[PDB]
Amino acid sequence: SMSLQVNLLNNTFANPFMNAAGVMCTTTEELVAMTESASGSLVSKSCTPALREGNPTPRYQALPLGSINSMGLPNNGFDFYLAYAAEQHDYGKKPLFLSMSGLSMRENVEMCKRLAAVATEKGVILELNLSCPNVPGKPQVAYDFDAMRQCLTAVSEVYPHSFGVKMPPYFDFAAFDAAAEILNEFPKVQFITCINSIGNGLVIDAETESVVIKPKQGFGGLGGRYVLPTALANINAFYRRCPGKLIFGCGGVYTGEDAFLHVLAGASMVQVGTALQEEGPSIFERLTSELLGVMAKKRYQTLDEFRGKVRTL
Amino acid sequence: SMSLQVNLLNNTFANPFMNAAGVMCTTTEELVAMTESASGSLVSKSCTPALREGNPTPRYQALPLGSINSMGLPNNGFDFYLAYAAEQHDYGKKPLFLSMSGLSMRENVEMCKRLAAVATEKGVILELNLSCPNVPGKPQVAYDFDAMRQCLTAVSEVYPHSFGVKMPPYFDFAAFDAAAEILNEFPKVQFITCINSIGNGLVIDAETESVVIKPKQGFGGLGGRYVLPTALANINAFYRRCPGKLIFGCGGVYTGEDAFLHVLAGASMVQVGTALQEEGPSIFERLTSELLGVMAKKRYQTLDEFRGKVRTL
Ligand SMILES: Cc1cc2nc3c(=O)[nH]c(=O)nc-3n(C[C@H](O)[C@H](O)[C@H](O)COP(=O)(O)O)c2cc1C
Ligand SMILES: Cc1cc2nc3c(=O)[nH]c(=O)nc-3n(C[C@H](O)[C@H](O)[C@H](O)COP(=O)(O)O)c2cc1C
Ligand SMILES: O=C(O)c1cc(=O)[nH]c(=O)[nH]1
Ligand SMILES: O=C(O)c1cc(=O)[nH]c(=O)[nH]1
Ligand code: NI
């Protein structure tokens, strides 16, 4: 009588849950573990053309209300994630997203040219990251609407497939309108993932009288409980302003109820970051169970019945 | 042996605590209550040239982790707050800040021209709000740097006194740098208040499947526990980039420990919003007491001894 099934991008997903890019998806063993998990899908660590060591440690800290990180894009490099998608991933189990985070337009252009064939042959789907806020001396691409337009223009020009974009959060309607206007000019952009972390917060430990991460004087992206209302705002804002596109939710999901809120705001897929970092891939069994439980109590049978139907006053 | 005393802008404050603008400071009764409280200071509700009714209700909601509001600047009008500063306020009890939020540059200019004489005669201090996120169709001035520079020029032109600016949160270093560079052009800007609410979040009540405030489809500014690391980040960011100015902290202060963090980050004064809304002006006796307790356990006697001294790794 009940179903968490999702159909989009010419795929069927058993449920809307997946990891947030960058969480538990860097190594072969992590990718295998996500594939073997109860999640409906998975996305690989945001990649650069060559392997990156990332920022000095400590660079992640769990917190009572979430997390702060300045990882600095540590990743195995594009060849590695391309090879996983081309040769190793079991598409029989679930669809695969590959997150790309080139440090320049030219890097994204070069990687997309090579990804094209693998997307065609295997069905891997590109999630293009325009919102990394932890690489020193590199402003978030999507806070500069001109840099955003140019990046999307280049990728659309060279990449012969649909793709999605991972967005930083915005905090005013003018920004929502400006971002949506740009995104709506690109028909290949078929999903929008809202949101990446809330950028450059600063956690201070009262006992040590110090920051808690090493890079960038302790400034890092916030995730977890801190970001849920901001995530829902962005999910709903683009859900409304980009009616021709799907929205993937990301931010502050720890429970089936949290996920229910994401869907109500407009989300098709629901990404899990901080909570997954702290619990491991077994969380997806708990989350599907919980979401089904929420739906049971509210008398919903499918996600379609309430997606985007949040009531305004 | 210990003291919460603060000295700035030719004034002495018994302690760093004050209300955040907009919280419990709209009516005569509220202003007197703040003046009679244990707070080191107070600021009046952000004003427009004429009275405003504000947005339709409900327009504020207390939450487990903070608050969301879209008040829409309900206020008694400039004449009313000017009159309170000129004629009624007991400066013998504590200094007074007047918050100003004209809906246009020209509105601020005209109010400042009239405030000048009262500042001279009575010592009231202007906090110029460049960051109201809840009046529909009106974008936050401080997210537009050229506009911000223009406004500060226009005001400095007509207002022969020191003043401060209430800033929205920023989320990347390029933005910290740009804002600080504008503010550093204007010597009259002697303090910076970080931060106004995190703008346009969206709270959804899972039981009702609806938003919780009426204006703007449920979108509103976030305060409280949600905003503390963003507040600390902005306090510290401007503390570092504007060494010729003082920083007032605002955001997420519920305890003396929270206030201790604000000061460590660089704050001279510490403003209390959401917590004050939920607890009333008695909160200031608890906060002074708690901060003294935190200082005793840590063997500090004055705020100077640790202000801005947060340790990086
Ligand atoms: C450790 C860590 C690494 C992350 N790395 C990436 C990344 O490589 N690419 C990306 O798009 N987002 C990255 N993020 C952001 C998350 O994908 C997600 O947008 C954010 O953490 C909010 O979700 P949460 O509240 O569930 O954590 C990372 C987050 C964390 C905590
Ligand atoms: C009810 C309410 C009304 C507010 N009105 C104003 C205002 O008139 N002027 C202003 O600068 N900020 C206003 N704000 C923002 C607060 O001054 C403060 O910057 C924000 O709430 C963060 O502090 P908190 O975390 O202590 O709530 C208001 C906040 C609340 C909750
Ligand atoms: O690798 C990182 O540091 C990182 C990337 C990103 O997109 N988001 C994030 O929070 N961290
Ligand atoms: O009156 C309001 O709506 C308001 C003004 C402001 O500056 N900040 C805020 O959170 N609310
Ligand atoms: Ni922004």
Side-chain angles (χ1 to χ4, degrees), chain A residues 58-86 88-109 111-112 114-130:
Chain A
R59 59 197 185 178
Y60 175 88
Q61 170 77 59
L63 307 160
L65 293 183
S67 68
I68 182 172
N69 86 83
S70 185
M71 308 293 295
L73 292 178
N75 77 99
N76 287 348
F78 172 72
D79 293 2
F80 172 91
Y81 301 102
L82 189 64
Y84 176 77
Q88 305 163 233
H89 179 72
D90 180 4
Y91 291 92
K93 184 49 192 309
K94 65 186 65 164
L96 170 69
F97 292 86
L98 178 152
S99 172
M100 182 181 300
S101 193
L103 296 192
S104 68
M105 176 197 83
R106 109 197 115 248
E107 291 189 2
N108 287 319
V109 169
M111 288 182 285
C112 286
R114 296 172 56 197
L115 178 62
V118 180
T120 295
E121 300 181 21
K122 308 295 298 188
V124 61
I125 305 166
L126 168 63
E127 183 182 82
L128 180 69
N129 183 357
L130 303 167

Side-chain angles (χ1 to χ4, degrees), chain A residues 58 65 139-140 143 171-173 176 198-206 208-214 216-217 219 222 225-226 229-230 232-233 236-237 240 257 260-261 264-265 298 300 309-313, chain B residues 58 65 140 143 171-174 176 198-206 208-214 216-217 219 222 225-226 229-230 232-233 236-237 240 257 260-261 264-265 298 300 309-313:
Chain A
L65 293 183
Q140 315 184 35
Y143 282 172
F171 302 92
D172 54 78
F173 277 37
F176 291 149
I198 293 186
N200 294 289
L202 180 62
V203 167
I204 301 177
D205 180 335
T208 63
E209 306 181 20
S210 75
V211 308
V212 303
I213 58 171
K214 177 161 180 173
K216 265 153 60 76
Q217 299 82 50
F219 289 74
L222 309 167
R225 302 188 72 183
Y226 286 114
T230 297
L232 300 173
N236 189 241
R240 294 169 178 279
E257 177 167 299
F260 176 83
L261 296 181
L264 206 55
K298 289 174 160 296
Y300 288 117
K309 299 202 194 307
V310 57
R311 175 169 57 84
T312 65
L313 323 171
Chain B
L65 294 178
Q140 322 186 219
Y143 284 155
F171 302 92
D172 65 74
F173 278 31
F176 294 145
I198 293 182
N200 293 287
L202 180 61
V203 168
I204 302 177
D205 178 333
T208 70
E209 305 177 26
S210 72
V211 305
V212 307
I213 55 168
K214 176 161 177 182
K216 285 176 62 189
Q217 293 76 236
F219 291 73
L222 307 173
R225 296 187 76 194
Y226 287 114
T230 292
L232 294 178
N236 190 242
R240 291 175 182 275
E257 181 162 294
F260 176 76
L261 297 179
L264 257 197
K298 286 169 164 299
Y300 289 119
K309 299 210 195 308
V310 58
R311 176 169 58 87
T312 61
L313 317 180

Side-chain angles (χ1 to χ4, degrees), chain A residues 45-46 69-74 129 131-134 166 196-197 221:
Chain A
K45 168 69 188 179
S46 288
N69 86 83
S70 185
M71 308 293 295
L73 292 178
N129 183 357
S131 49
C132 174
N134 294 321
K166 173 85 168 275
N196 210 309
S197 40

Side-chain angles (χ1 to χ4, degrees), chain B residues 82-86 88-104:
Chain B
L82 191 64
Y84 175 81
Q88 308 157 48
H89 180 75
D90 185 4
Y91 292 88
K93 177 54 191 300
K94 66 189 68 168
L96 167 72
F97 291 89
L98 183 151
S99 176
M100 177 181 305
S101 193
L103 302 190
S104 74

Side-chain angles (χ1 to χ4, degrees), chain B residues 101-119:
Chain B
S101 193
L103 302 190
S104 74
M105 174 177 316
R106 98 189 70 78
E107 285 190 3
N108 287 318
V109 175
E110 290 301 304
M111 291 185 284
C112 283
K113 273 196 268 210
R114 293 176 55 205
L115 181 63
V118 178

